[PDB]
Design a protein around this ligand. Structure first.
Ligand SMILES: [Zn+2]
Length: 133
């Protein structure tokens, strides 16, 4: 149900013409993004690769735990719930555990605020994020 387009309209919209953001606005983007990905699952490989530019490894760790609190598998692409509320309290299967780890291990630790132009339609990520399978 979550898409690049939905993220651009609901999260990024106020910021689209800003040359620069304050720490404060960058903080609003995370909070709003993270919040959308609790209410919704990610539709798309395309959309997983896109959301990577907004998450640090920690942000992703919190995303998973907030998803467990809400009875969904930690891997954002998964419409199913976890297996049982070692890693099986976080994921539906072993396979989504690895998929999740595979994803996270690519996320930068560079603070969001320091990712110049990350809010722009036009931004270029340092590498293409890979999804397991
Ligand atoms: Zn799952």
């Amino acid at each position: 149900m979550a898409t690049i387009e939905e993220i651009k309209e609901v999260v990024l919209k106020p910021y689209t013409n800003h040359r620069q953001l304050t720490i404060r606005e960058v903080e609003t983007i995370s909070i709003n993004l993270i919040d959308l990905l609790i209410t919704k699952d990610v539709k798309d490989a395309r959309t997983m690769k896109y959301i990577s530019r907004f998450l640090t490894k920690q942000d992703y760790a919190d995303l998973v735990q907030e998803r467990n609190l809400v009875k969904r598998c930690g891997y954002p692409l998964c419409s199913k719930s976890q297996a049982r509320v070692a890693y099986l309290t976080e994921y539906c299967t072993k396979a989504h555990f690895r998929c999740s780890q595979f994803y996270q291990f690519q996320l930068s630790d560079e603070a969001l605020f320091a990712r110049v132009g990350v809010h722009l339609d036009d931004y270029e990520p340092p590498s293409e994020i890979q999804l397991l399978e």
